[PDB]
């Protein structure tokens, strides 16, 4: 019998709606693109993830906060020469300054006033504006590297829930507020009006509904401010003389965000009826008049937009948007009417969320602070555990037996053992206190009783001790400090393999626990897997170049077939995520990305996105018909399990003909 | 039985009128259900029944056009554009053979009304 | 019907008198107009019956073919399997 497949659509797992995003760097159209470009997504269950837009958008680092915490605003700080830092908000009154080392909030400044609604970093990144809910706008000074946050001043109070902020320079903070009005506070050193506002420009209201401006940004070339509000009225105000240059009732419902580019020929607005459209000032007579046209329109989405961003370079220029349907849509920026857009898949699970095991033919599926275990045969949804001390979930791996389950959380991680009494399980917690007090990123089950643990402090231990070799600090790793941080490790019978996001992959002994690195990689190491047959570990980077290595370094299969790879492997968009080997030939290996599956041999040889700059330093089988793909593996010998995904809005009606 | 022999004759040769005779010997809507449960390329029995219906539309035997209308209302999907050599003129003069019924139905009900009228009025003319 | 019997039995019992009445359709012009209004729409309601019978008979035979889960189904979703395992720390504390 051929490979019998499970189309399995059990697990109701979905990321929550994305609410905010922000690029790291600044645009600088006529500059070669920096190697440290990052893009931070913040959803509505507090799981701030990051992405790197080069090499077709590989997600690397997830910083997840658990039950009942959100993020409705975040921003980057990159002063010239120091660590890139994220300042995000929660639902309540704290600017949380995250680390970019190991996913921990290194500072949580409770801001003195109100409930925070929006952040805006200042230019030259020394000051920061938050907008509270009592009416205040608070300035926070951030200087002295990481960890430091001091309140500087609050500006002049008022009686409107301050909704959005944006700086002009180091001087003027523009804030749109929930009465309708957008106000312009000044906050500049050595000048007699500090903390005072200057003007309260007033957007046009409506009688049946409280109109409230949802966003406002500054436009530096034509010295304007663009405002978007809750009647769709995108209004372009003049900055000095403080009044309305022109107006548009373009949109049809609440405009929620907008952006521009580095020299302000374009303003891209996007609202709640998902119609993202682009106002232009491209022609020379239109910039002589400095007047904006309602140039192009585009519908792209299913339900909403709740955030947008833009980026430019001399090798990359694109816009990234997202809404209450959970995806991420990318358009070419300077060719918005011309450009070939791209939809991202809703899950590219480069930190996986569902595991299987071949004893009892069972599948474990861990949602947020909740695990669910079932098994095969039809099937039976056996058991469901919820944990209340565990809040933000992580990797949750099962033994090579139906006994020991380790559930990870970077604060407190636990172990149970499992008594199968038939149609239900019995779960018995066992106290492992060294485990409960350490911090875990990867738990991988060397033997059936003892496990290995990675650390949040770049150590490696054994539960039921291990050393590693150091790694040099490149200036990009100074500029973003999780490049030099171990991201993957695989074990099977006293041999381990680790791999950072730097491009270095080490072996690891267990009978002697010495490193022996074997670096061999330029760009980001996506997926690794040891192979007992031929003593060969397989890596695959984000470039979809597959490699295998030998310990005590190369096979000519890895020398030839990598650069003579198959054609789908050449033109592949979505990156690989998971690797595993076959049941019957231990050197035929069946691995997978989130939109495809490739089963490869080992000897059968054969005869937009950012691309300008260098790396992050300074028989064949291919199928596609399981595209909303969560997790594929092997239940048992002849069978192969897909784990798939399956399911108001604005009424933008399709014309019937 | 009769349906099995009819299916064997239909998959064998051009004995479709004998297959209609075998389904007549079975004489069952269940037998019609059995033959439409039988799976093959079931063409050209429509051609036989088109010639038979166009040469005798006023035949008292309900069972052969009931069998083929049950075939039409059950396999009405998988036959539409699959044949277009002779089937357009075939179904066209079949429809021309079948317009006569719906143009004579009101006058037939009129004669039925006259006959019911005359029958029960002569029954009322009873002479004590 | 329950007075269509009435409007026919007057014709059946008395026909010859109103036949010999020299102006039939002039003073009976309302009733046969009503009846031709009632009876001139036969062919498309036959079409209604044809297409409705076709669709509901096709659905009926397909449901009779594929209605093989009419005793006990919809398993592998249990509140008792969830019972206190969905707590899993209330039982750990208490």
């Amino acid at each position: 019998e051929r490979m019998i497949v499970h189309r399995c659509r059990f697990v109701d797992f979905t990321p929550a709606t994305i609410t905010s995003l922000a690029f790291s760097h600044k645009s600088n159209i006529n500059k070669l693109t920096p190697s440290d470009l990052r893009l931070a997504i913040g959803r509505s269950n507090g799981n701030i993830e990051i992405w790197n837009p080069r090499n077709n958008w590989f997600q690397e680092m997830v910083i997840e906060g658990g039950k009942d915490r959100s993020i409705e605003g975040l921003c980057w700080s990159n002063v010239n020469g120091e660590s890139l830092r994220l300042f995000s908000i929660g639902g309540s009154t704290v600017v949380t300054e995250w680390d970019l080392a190991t996913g921990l909030p290194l500072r949580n400044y409770d801001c003195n006033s109100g409930v925070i609604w929006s952040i805006s970093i200042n230019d030259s990144q020394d000051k920061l504006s938050v907008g509270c809910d009592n009416g205040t706008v608070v300035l926070i000074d951030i200087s002295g590297g990481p960890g430091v946050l001091e309140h500087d001043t609050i500006l002049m109070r008022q009686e409107a829930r301050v909704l959005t902020l944006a700086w002009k320079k180091d001087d003027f903070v523009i804030g749109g507020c929930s009465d309708g009005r957008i106000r312009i506070w000044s906050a500049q050193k050595n000048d007699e009006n500090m903390g005072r506002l200057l003007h309260t420009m007033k957007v046009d209201k409506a009688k049946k509904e409280s109109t409230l401006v949802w966003s406002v940004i500054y436009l530096p070339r034509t010295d304007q401010i663009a405002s978007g509000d809750s009647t769709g009225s995108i209004k372009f105000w003049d900055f000095q003389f403080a009044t309305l240059n022109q107006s548009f009732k373009a949109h049809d419902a609440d405009v929620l965000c907008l952006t521009t580019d580095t020299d302000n020929n374009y303003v891209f607005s996007a609202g709640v009826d998902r119609k993202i459209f682009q106002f232009s000032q491209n022609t020379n007579k239109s910039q002589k008049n400095n007047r904006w046209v309602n140039s192009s329109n585009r519908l792209l989405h299913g339900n909403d937009i709740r955030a947008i961003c833009a980026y430019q370079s001399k090798g990359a220029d694109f816009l990234v948007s997202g809404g209450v349907e959970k995806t991420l849509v990318i358009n070419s920026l300077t060719s918005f009417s011309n450009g070939n857009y791209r939809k991202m898949p809703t899950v590219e699970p480069y930190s996986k969320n569902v595991l299987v095991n071949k004893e009892q033919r069972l599948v474990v599926s861990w949602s947020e602070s909740t695990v669910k275990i079932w098994t095969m045969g039809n099937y039976k949804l056996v058991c469901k555990l919820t944990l209340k001390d565990d809040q933000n979930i992580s990797t949750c791996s099962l033994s090579p037996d139906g006994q020991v389950l380790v559930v990870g959380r970077p604060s407190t991680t636990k172990v149970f053992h499992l008594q199968p009494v038939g149609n239900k399980l019995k779960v018995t917690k066992l106290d492992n206190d060294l485990l409960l007090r350490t911090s875990t990123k990867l738990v991988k089950f060397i033997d059936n009783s003892k496990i290995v643990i990675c650390s949040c402090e770049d150590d490696v231990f054994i539960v039921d001790e291990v050393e590693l070799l150091e790694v040099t600090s490149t200036k990009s790793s100074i500029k973003v400090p999780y490049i030099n941080r171990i991201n993957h490790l695989e074990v099977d019978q006293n041999i381990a393999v680790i791999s950072r996001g730097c491009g270095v992959v080490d072996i690891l002994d267990l009978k002697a626990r010495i490193s022996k690195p074997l670096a061999r990689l330029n760009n980001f190491i996506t997926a690794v897997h040891i192979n007992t047959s031929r003593k060969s570990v397989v890596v695959i980077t984000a470039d979809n170049k597959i490699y295998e290595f030998n310990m005590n370094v190369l096979t000519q299969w890895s020398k030839n077939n990598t650069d003579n790879l198959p054609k789908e492997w050449k033109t592949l968009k979505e990156n690989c995520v998971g690797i595993f080997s076959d049941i019957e030939n231990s050197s035929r290996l069946w691995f997978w990305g989130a939109t495809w599956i490739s089963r490869i041999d080992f000897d059968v040889d054969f005869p937009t996105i950012t691309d300008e700059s260098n790396f992050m330093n300074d028989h064949f089988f291919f199928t596609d018909k399981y595209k909303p793909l969560l997790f594929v593996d092997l239940i048992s010998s002849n069978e192969l399990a897909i784990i798939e995904r399956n399911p108001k809005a604005f009424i933008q009606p399709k014309l019937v003909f | 039985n009769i349906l099995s022999s009819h299916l064997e004759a239909n998959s064998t040769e051009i004995l479709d009128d004998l297959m209609s005779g075998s389904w007549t010997e079975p004489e069952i809507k269940k037998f019609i259900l059995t033959k439409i449960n039988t799976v093959d390329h079931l063409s050209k029995i429509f051609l036989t029944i088109s010639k038979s219906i166009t040469q005798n539309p006023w035949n008292e035997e309900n069972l052969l056009p009931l069998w083929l209308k049950w075939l039409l209302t059950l396999k009405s999907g998988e036959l539409n554009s699959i044949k277009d050599k002779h089937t357009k003129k075939n179904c066209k003069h079949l429809k021309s053979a079948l317009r006569s019924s719906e143009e004579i139905l009101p006058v037939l009900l009129g004669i039925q009304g006259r006959l019911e009228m005359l029958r029960r009025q002569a029954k009322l003319r009873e002479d004590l | 019907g329950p007075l269509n019997v009435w409007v026919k039995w007057c014709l059946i019992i008395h026909g010859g008198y109103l036949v010999s009445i020299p102006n039939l359709m002039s003073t009976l012009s309302s009733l046969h107009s009503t009846l031709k209004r009632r009876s001139d729409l036969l062919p498309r309601l036959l079409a209604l019956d044809a297409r409705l019978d076709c669709t509901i008979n096709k659905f009926k035979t397909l449901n009779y073919e594929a209605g093989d889960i009419h005793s006990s189904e919809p398993v592998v979703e249990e509140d008792e399997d969830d019972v206190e395992y969905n707590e899993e720390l209330d039982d750990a504390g208490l």
Binding site: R2, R7, F10, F621 | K69, L105, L108 | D49, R51
Partner: peptide
């Protein structure tokens, strides 16, 4: 019998989802 065949051949004239778990197979 005439009105029976008449109505029967006017009848002739006017006669003129995702399940949660499945099991499939692939190739080699």
């Amino acid at each position: 019998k005439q009105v029976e065949i008449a109505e029967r051949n006017t009848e002739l004239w006017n006669l003129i989802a995702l399940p949660t778990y499945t099991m499939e197979y692939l190739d080699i």
